Amino acid sequence: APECGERASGKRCPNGKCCSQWGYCGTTDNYCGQGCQSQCDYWRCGRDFGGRLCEEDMCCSKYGWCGYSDDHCEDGCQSQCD
């Protein structure tokens, strides 16, 4: 029962999740890695990714990675740094 992708009339996953090669939504390698059809950038963010905001209040690092550490939230953080 496809949730996203070519097998689901081009539907995109809610909460920016990755659409796997099999048409399912997730945030792990099986969904965001090889074969991912859309929103494969769930863990990426900022200036090089359409100014996208991270889900679950994650900070966007200066290198465009979603996380909660000082490397993500302080020097150069792009969004949701608090």
Swiss-Prot record:
Highest taxon above the source species: Eukaryota
Molecular function GO labels: carbohydrate binding; chitin binding
Coiled-coil boundaries: none
PROSITE patterns tied to this protein: CHIT_BIND_I_1, CHIT_BIND_I_2
S-S pairs: C4-C19, C13-C25, C18-C32, C36-C40, C45-C60, C54-C66, C59-C73, C77-C81
Domain Chitin-binding type-1, first and last residues per copy: 1-42, 43-82
Binding-site list for a carbohydrate: S20, W22, Y24, Y31, W43, S61, Y63, W65, H72
Listed GO biological process terms: positive regulation of cell division; positive regulation of mitotic nuclear division
Keywords for this protein: Chitin-binding, Disulfide bond, Lectin, Mitogen, Repeat
Function according to Swiss-Prot or TrEMBL: N-acetyl-D-glucosamine binding lectin. Shows no hemagglutinating activity towards rabbit erythrocytes and weak activity towards trypsin-treated erythrocytes. Has mitogenic activity towards human peripheral blood lymphocytes (HPBL).
Subunit (UniProt): Monomer.
Name of the protein: Lectin-D2
Organism name: Phytolacca americana (American pokeweed)
